[PDB]
Design an enzyme around this catalytic site. Structure first.
Site, PDB file in Angstrom:
ATOM      1  N   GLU A   1      41.987  40.349  38.903  1.00 33.73           N
ATOM      2  CA  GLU A   1      41.292  39.174  38.327  1.00 33.73           C
ATOM      3  C   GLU A   1      42.252  38.389  37.433  1.00 33.73           C
ATOM      4  O   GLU A   1      41.864  38.164  36.249  1.00 33.73           O
ATOM      5  CB  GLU A   1      40.070  39.611  37.528  1.00 33.73           C
ATOM      6  CG  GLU A   1      39.092  40.412  38.367  1.00 33.73           C
ATOM      7  CD  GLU A   1      38.424  39.586  39.463  1.00 33.73           C
ATOM      8  OE1 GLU A   1      37.770  40.194  40.335  1.00 33.73           O
ATOM      9  OE2 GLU A   1      38.563  38.332  39.435  1.00 33.73           O
ATOM     10  N   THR A  51      42.975  38.899  48.850  1.00 27.33           N
ATOM     11  CA  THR A  51      44.415  39.224  48.695  1.00 27.33           C
ATOM     12  C   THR A  51      44.998  39.761  50.002  1.00 27.33           C
ATOM     13  O   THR A  51      44.265  40.377  50.810  1.00 27.33           O
ATOM     14  CB  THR A  51      44.696  40.080  47.452  1.00 27.33           C
ATOM     15  OG1 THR A  51      44.016  41.324  47.603  1.00 27.33           O
ATOM     16  CG2 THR A  51      44.224  39.392  46.183  1.00 27.33           C
ATOM     17  N   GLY A  64      37.900  46.090  47.831  1.00 29.26           N
ATOM     18  CA  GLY A  64      36.977  47.238  47.794  1.00 29.26           C
ATOM     19  C   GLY A  64      36.054  47.167  49.001  1.00 29.26           C
ATOM     20  O   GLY A  64      35.591  46.046  49.340  1.00 29.26           O
TER      21      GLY A  64
END
Ligand SMILES: Cc1cc2nc3c(=O)[nH]c(=O)nc-3n(C[C@H](O)[C@H](O)[C@H](O)COP(=O)(O)OP(=O)(O)OC[C@H]3O[C@@H](n4cnc5c(N)ncnc54)[C@H](O)[C@@H]3O)c2cc1C
Ligand SMILES: Cc1cc2nc3c(=O)[nH]c(=O)nc-3n(C[C@H](O)[C@H](O)[C@H](O)COP(=O)(O)OP(=O)(O)OC[C@H]3O[C@@H](n4cnc5c(N)ncnc54)[C@H](O)[C@@H]3O)c2cc1C
Lengths: 607, 612
Positions: B400, B139, B178
């Site tokens: 997701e 992203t 992350g």
């Protein structure tokens, strides 16, 4: 300015400036509010690091310091009208609650309006000077809703003419009061009064808890912070344990009752009104952030070869936000209506104010989070300002009457009104529709009537179900408990009708025809969305047919399209300054991306 | 033990131990899970200060550390077996997200599945010693849903046999991944492949980002934490700005497409499934805390002057919580059904996983906050554990596949299926109910499934017909889709709701223990009847049920609340959450709330001093 926002603002059908005047109440109230906020905006004393970057301890320090300078500054600038103090307080604290709220909001008002003259001599000036800092300690670890089960005692001692204040158990300890942990050196303590050997119930006592000057807990006082919470990081929400702590007889609040020196015993709608307006304000700020950011954010595809549209072009995104925008305006007018009829005016008022507190706080609560989730990932980051608005607004649904209990207090007044009617009498005000025991979807007056019939049906079901349980169960109280879901549904439908009626009525008093037009589109969208979302309540009782529900759902989709070109100006009219939103996504200028990258680089894990 | 929790537990109609076996899948899975948890429970290495009393930097420090100790200990004990690793990780992290998630779940798995021996030789081996710590940067600040719109470029240089990875704009910057903030020294980066001529769309590239020793950022690399969020304090969710950074041509993952040294160009479903189980688990923990606390907490009056009753005796408190406990069990059985279907597996699976991920995560999301508000004031204190469960679960509705987009995928499938049935062809699977296009027994799970079937068929047909109308009106399919998208989401919602009722209903017939089957039956009926009550309009239209049947549905829900009341504590005990997994003074097993609450607060940070 971002060219999507300039274009959105240029194509609006109305002057948002004039709508801000309607929301404030007059052009002069707008000017006065803007003057107070503009007094503060560039004052260095009211500037600090971003509060999301700090520890809880630091946030508490920042907020207590601001609340002090701000008490001083409001006096220097001679601000003294209750509206103006609130304009000033709001803007200083940027949506966060503030640690002197209970001192300024409860302790000082209680002294001026409930305390004796000699109590005012002793307490009022030292309180006004912040020499005495006060809170209001009602709730205990063990009791919040049922005040009759409060365990704190005030036992009269005739030998010394004192009250002995006692927390006999761990559950009895006072729990939650703002400013009680670290800030306050006095507290008003709600306690069961015992004199001779009889209990006379709940009474209020002025209780010193810390030394003035030193701030050390007094003998037999244990006091501290109850720890971290979902929000209220800036507030020292506290506990108080009293070990037979003695105070003068004359520290009891004796407005309605007295104890003589020998021990003889002689015989709020403001805040629930304020909380409806706070529900309006919180939802309004959330709609402002999400709607602006929806006009700025481009994503995905409609026409396959064409550039990414603004996500506000998606019918689903409109459906998430516009019915909330309508809800925000509706609650703004309910909040104004109740403020402007509390100064005019009672069983109905108490009932109505309880139900609308619960209805507006629940609906705003859900709204804010739908606004956050509508922004996608960036919504979840503190860059949105939406987490802080949620966590700081959400306790409104639990304090000042837990929402379920408030709805049951409403239902009690609706059953009382039902029994009055079926015993041949007449009822007045918002429940007057109970005396009577085909919709036009572009008429606010006609949808108001639909909502009336929904309420009457659910109020009659609650009454009849209640009547069957009273006849069948071992106690009337068991019957009440086993009808309690239906009684809450009745209170809810009653409240939803009142909101439709009040918003419908406001439309007829709008002088500007362009603003009247767009508010009417919001009033229709609110009403029609509510029918769409509660179709079964309109289908049963034949208030509306299946074909009409089809047409209701068609009209909701058209109103989305009507509202699209006015959405930015409609949130612009709330007139929130960037520092009040606390939001990179919802900046007035629409310059999100350059400012997000700055905000992120300056954030703490990058030192 | 609190004597109210003892009395409730003693009068339960069934044995919660056997229900734990059903949830875990076997008596041995239950025993093995508890053994892994109980070796983590007595390990001093996995012990720390109350996370609620720490700063965000301390929370991150505590998490990356437990995560490193956790990799080492799972190798030492030979903890392989996906279920065992999940049980180990879930318990070490106590419900918080784990900062090596993208490393263990996307970096190493991608290298093992996609990387050529050369790539695996210089990357996956030091990665298995935590010398290399990887992430996956999909992203961008400007693109999340619409990957095709990603702006990051990987331009091929035929001369120097390298890819040029560039972040042309502030929006191009990779955002959220992350581990990308501070943890990772390596990222698989997703980029538009330009070679000589033009762009050949999205491909993956292995981009080292920090030195293996200094952990210092490489030249051309700008990397950092994206700032604080609603939750995820433990995760360095990160950004990555690449300034025409250079990587060998063999850094491109080339299992299904290649760039020759001549610059010649040649040629989310397991996760969605897992998130259904996560929605189940998070709702289950929230119900555990609220139902135990409701059995412990006394307040207010029924018969006035009699003792204050447990708040769980109020019908309103039963209505807030028992429907959610019925949902928590529905969702456990939908999660297991997905897990069991995936392993085994003529498309429907993509549609169904998307729709069920959105349906369950949205519903769990709402239910956790309802549990919190049901506890009153104490709910709002971190003493309840519920604010943390909510903030760390809620992004499941966003990541997701954003939930609305996922419902719109499910609706592509439902429209295709509808067109196929109305062109004379037969569909199969969960949409087989569409084939059948042209009195409900409220004690029968089978008859209630049928009602849900007809509700879904009605809303699918309404979406389909509304879409055809807009197509002929606007002479653009993509615009008519937009103008029907609210109806289309409504069709997927109803479809997914039907599937949940169907699976819960079908699970009841596999329950061996009669007493368990009888109470799960009560939960299944409560799920089904509450859903009708809450959506009476979707059943009243098309004559699926009558007003008098809605009246009886409403009477029966009130009856099932009273029946479930005496089993509710046992039902939440059967989830077998340890106190440290719930992180909740209110929801402790032993019901000793008040003395523990006072200790918790007294030890909290602002009480390090009396005067601040
Ligand atoms: C941020 C915050 C700030 C606060 N500030 C203050 C403050 O400044 N001073 C202060 O004194 N207090 C304060 N409070 C506490 C507040 O007054 C209480 O939280 C409130 O009275 C609700 O009571 P409880 O928390 O004890 O919930 P409870 O009364 O224990 O109720 C919990 C649950 O029981 C249900 N229930 C209870 N009674 C009934 C009934 N009769 N019928 C049906 N259901 C019922 C409720 O609906 C809820 O679902 C604060 C609370 C918060 C969260
Ligand atoms: C806590 C957290 C952790 C994350 N971790 C990671 C990670 O480890 N790795 C990673 O790569 N990413 C990660 N992400 C990012 C995540 O993948 C994205 O947030 C997600 O893909 C959603 O896209 P977005 O945020 O750009 O929202 P957008 O795509 O901009 O969407 C915002 C709004 O637009 C609407 N919208 C978009 N497209 C359409 C359409 N076609 N039709 C209708 N409406 C539409 C959505 O419904 C939504 O309301 C994380 C996010 C969060 C919150």
């Amino acid at each position: 300015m971002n060219p999507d926002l300039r274009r959105e603002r240029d194509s609006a059908s109305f002057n948002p400036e004039l709508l801000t005047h309607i929301l404030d109440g007059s052009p002069e109230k707008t000017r006065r509010r803007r003057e107070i906020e503009n007094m503060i905006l560039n004052d260095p004393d009211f500037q600090h690091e971003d509060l999301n970057f700090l520890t809880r301890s630091q946030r508490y320090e920042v907020a207590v310091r601001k609340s002090a300078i701000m008490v001083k500054k409001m006096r220097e600038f001679g601000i003294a009208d209750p509206d103006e103090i609130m304009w000033f307080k709001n803007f200083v604290h940027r949506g966060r609650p503030e640690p002197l709220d209970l001192h300024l909001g409860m302790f000082l008002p209680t002294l001026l309006h409930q305390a004796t003259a000699e109590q005012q001599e002793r307490f009022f000036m030292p309180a006004w000077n912040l020499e005495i800092i006060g809170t209001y300690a009602q709730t205990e670890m063990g009791h919040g809703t049922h005040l009759r089960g409060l365990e704190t005692t005030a036992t009269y001692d005739p030998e010394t003419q004192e009250f002995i204040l006692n927390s006999p158990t761990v559950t009895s300890i006072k729990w939650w009061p703002g400013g009680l942990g670290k800030t306050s050196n006095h507290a008003i303590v709600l306690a069961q009064l015992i004199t001779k050997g009889k209990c006379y119930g709940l009474h209020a006592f002025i209780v010193p808890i810390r030394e003035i000057g030193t701030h050390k807990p007094l003998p037999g006082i244990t006091v501290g912070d109850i720890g971290p919470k979902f929000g209220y990081d800036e507030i020292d929400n506290g506990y108080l344990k009293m070990d037979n702590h003695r105070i003068p007889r004359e520290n009891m609040l004796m407005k309605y009752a007295q104890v003589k020196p020998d021990g003889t015993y002689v015989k709020m709608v403001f805040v629930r009104s304020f909380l409806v307006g706070e529900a309006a304000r919180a939802l309004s700020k959330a709609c402002t952030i999400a709607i602006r950011y929806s006009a700025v954010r481009h994503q995905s595809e409609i026409k396959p070869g064409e550039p990414e549209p603004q996500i506000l072009d998606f019918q689903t995104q409109q459906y998430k936000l516009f019915p909330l925008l309508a809800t925000a305006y509706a609650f703004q007018f309910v909040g104004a209506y109740m403020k402007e009829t509390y100064h005019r005016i009672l069983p109905e008022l108490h009932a109505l104010t309880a139900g609308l507190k619960a209805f507006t706080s629940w609906t705003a609560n859900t709204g804010i989070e739908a606004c956050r989730m509508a922004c996608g990932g960036h919504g979840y980051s503190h860059c949105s300002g939406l987490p802080n608005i949620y966590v700081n607004f959400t306790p409104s649904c639990t304090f000042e009457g837990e929402n379920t209990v408030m709805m049951l207090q409403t239902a009690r007044f609706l059953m009382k009104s039902y029994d009055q009617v079926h015993s041949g009498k007449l009822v007045c005000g918002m429940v007057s529709y109970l005396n009577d025991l085909m919709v036009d979807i572009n008429s606010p007056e006609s949808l108001t009537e639909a909502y009336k019939l929904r309420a009457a049906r659910l109020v009659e079901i609650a009454a009849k179900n209640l009547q069957k349980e009273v006849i069948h169960r071992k106690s009337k109280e068991v019957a009440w408990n086993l009808t309690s879901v239906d009684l809450v549904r009745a209170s809810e439908a009653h409240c939803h009708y009142v909101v439709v009626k009040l918003f419908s009525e406001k439309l007829l008093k709008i002088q500007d025809k362009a603003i009247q037009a767009v508010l009417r589109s919001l009033c229709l969208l609110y009403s029609l969305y509510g029918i769409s979302q509660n179709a079964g309540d309109f289908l049963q009782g034949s208030i509306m047919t299946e074909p009409q529900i089809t047409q209701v759902n068609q009209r909701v989709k058209e109103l989305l399209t009507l509202i699209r070109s006015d959405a930015v100006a409609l949130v612009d009219a709330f007139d929130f300054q960037d520092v009040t939103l606390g939001s990179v996504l919802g900046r007035y200028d629409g310059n999100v991306y350059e400012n997000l990258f700055e905000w992120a680089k300056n954030s703490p894990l990058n030192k």
